[PDB]
């Protein structure tokens, strides 16, 4: 939570823990729906893995707007100091 | 000195060493403290009956009553600790470091 | 022989003690609980047979399923049956506990309590009279009387 680099590394570590995402195609700017081949429920359990890791609640009207790990790390940067 | 008095003193020091090395709980501290009180009762009673010193026979009962009341006070303190943390753990009693 | 005689007399002893001291856990499910209460009432009086009134389930000897077993309570029936020490016995009282009865084609009714628990005595009636429930209890005692536990132990 100190730097953007630790948050980005922890986002990519969470998304490589998740089994259905292929870690080869998994990049920073990879889209979830049309690229990684994920259902919406897959994206929502991704957001709940992010809540389990980063230790806060993410509401619904701003987790619908998290379609890539770059917007995830930008959202956590917006909701923290970095 | 004597032998059975040395045994009751040995029990007093053993419950003292248990009262001076805390493991987990405050109830263990209160139990070692009341084992100390028990050994004080036993040793006072054997001295008072040995010398046939009559008026001191009320003394161990006094030594019981106050100290048992003392134990009641300790139990109540433990309860208030267990009403704040849920356990009687002595490591929850460390807020007075600062 | 000699050991056959010893296990036969000890079978008679333990069968006598078990049948003359049956303690029931009555499931008060439905209308058959009323007639079980009449079987415990002074006229028929189960207590003079050694059959006490409302024993606790963790020491009872016979489970009397008296009333309608529905789907919401059948796991509770099997749970209380599993909490009974052996030798446990099941007396099924009335038509809904026997085979579903008047609610056989219902969406919510277990069609017989013998889909749930192993049943020893089927007591028929809607409700069976308390005299007939007492007949079923005495037939259970005669079934306990002809058990051969130590005889089959000595022969196996």
């Amino acid at each position: 939570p100190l730097t953007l680099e630790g948050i980005k590394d922890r986002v990519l570590y969470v998304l490589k823990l998740y089994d259905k995402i292929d870690p080869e195609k998994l990049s920073v700017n990879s889209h979830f729906m049309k690229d990684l081949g994920l259902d919406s429920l897959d994206q929502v359990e991704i957001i709940m893995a992010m809540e389990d890791e980063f230790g806060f609640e993410i509401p619904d009207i701003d987790a619908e707007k998290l379609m890539c790990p770059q917007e995830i790390v930008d959202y956590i940067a917006d909701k923290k100091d970095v | 000195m004597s032998l059975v008095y040395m045994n009751i003193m040995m029990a007093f020091t053993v419950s003292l060493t248990g009262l001076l090395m805390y493991r987990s709980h405050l109830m263990s501290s209160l139990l070692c403290l009341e084992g100390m009180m028990l050994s004080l009762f036993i040793l006072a009673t054997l001295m008072i009956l040995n010398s046939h010193f009559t008026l001191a026979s009320m003394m161990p009962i006094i030594l019981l009553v106050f100290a048992a009341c003392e134990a009641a006070l300790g139990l109540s303190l433990l309860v208030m600790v267990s009403n704040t943390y849920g356990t009687d753990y002595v490591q929850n009693l460390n807020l007075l470091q600062c | 022989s000699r050991g056959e005689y010893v296990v036969a007399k000890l079978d008679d002893l333990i069968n006598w003690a078990r049948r003359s001291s049956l303690w029931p856990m009555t499931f008060g499910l439905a209308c058959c609980a009323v007639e079980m209460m009449h079987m415990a009432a002074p006229r028929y009086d189960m207590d003079r047979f050694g059959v006490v009134f409302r024993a606790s389930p963790r020491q009872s000897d016979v489970m009397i399923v008296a009333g309608t077993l529905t789907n919401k309570m059948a796991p509770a029936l099997r749970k209380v049956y599993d909490q009974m020490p052996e030798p446990r016995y099941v007396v099924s009282m009335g038509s809904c506990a026997n085979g579903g009865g008047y609610y056989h084609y219902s969406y919510s009714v277990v069609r017989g309590c013998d889909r749930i628990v192993p049943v020893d005595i089927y007591v028929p009636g809607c409700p069976p009279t308390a005299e007939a429930l007492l007949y079923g209890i005495l037939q259970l005692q005669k079934k306990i009387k002809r058990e051969k536990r130590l005889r089959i132990w000595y022969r196996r």
Partner: protein
């Protein structure tokens, strides 16, 4: 001596009946049973009222411990002092009871 023999015989009969009560039905090869109440997985909440009646027992039991040598203290020569101190102890037990009353200590187990 006879008391120790009697305690030992009572303890032996007790342990013998417990040992018969455990080992005699374990002759049976009945069934090894599986699948293990008003709570399933709830913790125990503490109740302050049960602890209050326990400490109230302990304090009145100490006052009774003081009151115990009265059938022997009736035989003394200074009966005015003995009567004053006996009535004073039972009065202090009553004052402890009245203070337990009026501060709502005897409530919901009155």
């Amino acid at each position: 001596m006879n008391l120790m023999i009697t305690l030992l015989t009572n303890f032996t009969l007790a342990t013998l009946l417990v040992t018969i009560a455990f080992w005699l039905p374990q002759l049976n090869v009945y069934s090894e049973k599986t699948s293990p109440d008003p709570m399933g997985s709830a913790r125990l909440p503490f109740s302050m009222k049960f602890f209050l009646v326990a400490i109230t027992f302990l304090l009145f039991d100490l006052e009774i411990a003081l009151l115990l040598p009265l059938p022997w203290a009736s035989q003394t020569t200074n009966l005015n002092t003995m009567l004053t101190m006996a009535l004073l102890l039972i009065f202090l037990l009553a004052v402890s009871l009245a203070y337990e009353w009026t501060q709502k200590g005897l409530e919901w187990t009155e």
